[PDB]
Amino acid sequence: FVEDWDLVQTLGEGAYGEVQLAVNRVTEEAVAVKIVDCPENIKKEICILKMLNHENVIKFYGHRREGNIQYLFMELASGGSLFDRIEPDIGMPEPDAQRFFHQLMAGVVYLHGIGITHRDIKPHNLLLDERDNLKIADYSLATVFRYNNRERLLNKMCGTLPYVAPELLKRREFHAEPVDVWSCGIVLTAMLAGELPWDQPSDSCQEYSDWKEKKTYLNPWKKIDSAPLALLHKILVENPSARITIPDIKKDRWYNKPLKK
Template identity: 35%
Template sequence: MVSRGGARGLLGAYELGRTLGEGNFGKVKQARHRGSGAQFAVKILDRARVESQRVDDQIRREIATLKLLAHPNVVRLHEIAASKTKIYMVLELVNGGELFDRIASKGKLPEQEARRLFQQLIDGVSYCHEKGVYHRDLKPENVLVDRKGNIKISDFGLSALPQHLGNDGLLHTTCGSPNYIAPEVLQNRGYDGSLSDIWSCGVILYIMLVGYLPFDDRNIVVLYQKIFKGDTQIPEWLSPGVQNLLRRILEPNPMKRITMAEIKAHEWFLEDYVPALPYDNDDEDSELYIAHHFKEKISEAPEDKTTHQINAFQLIGMASSLDLSGFFEEEDVSLRKIRFTSTHPPEDLFDKIENSASEMGFHVHRGHSKLKLTRNCNGSVNQKNPVSFLVWTEVFELSPSLYVVELTKSHGDPALYRQLCERICSDLGVLKMDQIFGTRPIADDLASLDKRSATPLVAL
């Protein structure tokens, strides 16, 4: 956004400064409001890249979520705008780093400090729940800390709004980060977004106090089995009050798990508790709030003079699924590997996947523990031509009635891989692919499965 003359770029009332971060879909810049001098962070996303990766629906969900929220413990969206080439999000600048970094630097936090941060975390999360927003990916990396040591919840890319509830009033998208995911989320039977967020808050509290994860294993199957059982040790050197709270939060049966109201009434939680109040304009109509901020037009740098403004509500519109965090990662792993859970018997899973792939023109080879899907994308039947597309499929058992299906692209066209996954998921009756790719399904951010200890199901 730097002009050809060397001056800093302008974005309406903002002067853009140094780049804070950069990734595949755009960059984050520090910005100063020219009127007040206040500092902000501006996410500048490249529309062409966003649309080519089919994540524009994800942007809508992030904005639709953030525009509802105005709380001291939640990162705030101040303004949004879009041009023909860019999407801009003016966000609160939080420059104290991630909670993860604070824990990593100290090993663990004193109980008094952990309690204060946990109180702020619960204040922010419970406020979101009151607004009908369920985060679904709470972890120390998604909790920022400002220079004053106050928590700011961020990265609402996996969040759910009231319109995402099923007819049973429950959520059904399996998503989140493996070590923080609640057991009921893995079971494909629907779950209460509030109770699953509470579980994740409990994992964060455990890490702050103890310095390591309550549920961890290199093998994804073993990890999920530990989560299902609530298999963790709560150190006896912790105070009795927090031991009690942790046990009640990390209760694998959601019907027996402590509620948000009960957490706020817990004796340990109430010590030195000062509730955080929402901002004054919290009750403003959100659309009027956004419209107010679109009074100023955006001034692009000279090289982008032809920018054409679009209506903000074209951008917000319908919310479906979103993960902004992926815009700033080195690589979007969901483009080469996905995992999802299924209750179909293993034999049915292999048969259905083979039928789906065969009908799309893939050659299916059944091995001892996996399916190999190949296709010559050059359209030639010459056997001397190398196979130009290869996907491996494996199924792992979590419990007698729950399985993990893993699709891994070894090489080939990402668009064709996506079509294959869409077809398989459609035939299996699981999530829509925009949800799977947009929500980073369970365990996508694990580097790999430990094949030595995990027992895949035999495909033959």
């Protein structure tokens, strides 16, 4: 079907391009292939993809272009997505949420350490392997924010509104890492409550104003235990310079609470 690989079933559908299960005729290995038909975007995407080597990031195996279709071969995540484990209005058990958050932080420290920002962290982009290990997927908006040890500020507005940090809507230029931290906090909220707190983090949004006025007797907050809520209070801080960094998340009390066998 494509060189030595047989394309056997549809795993999902993207904006521009489906993902299929592909099985090697000789070795029997099953991978995923993203099929894509704005052509410079994939060259950048491929270039970032070749950099990735971590247990909580989807691995890139290579690509082949046939005609105008690019085939991106990658690690298969056969457990579906984190979005499927979140029950609406409920979330998931706190131990399971803590485990996924620890894995998410591991993958995000990894990306940041190679100078890559993901820019669209959300449950649909966090896939699971067959042992429910989390894999950060989808590098279509990813970009370099540090190169030769020099940081560059971002200016492009991108991502998904309910997950996006407020500076991205307010500031001409902004630091990459606190944006990804913020999206992880919205992810953690979703996992603990089964609901997103706001349409977008703007002063025109009542639910966002209500959080900034600390009305945590409202939903989703009132569904979340005090210990993880204290962490969310340090993550979902409007001023990105005052927002908690990953090294400090790792010192948080709930982060370090024993919960799971």
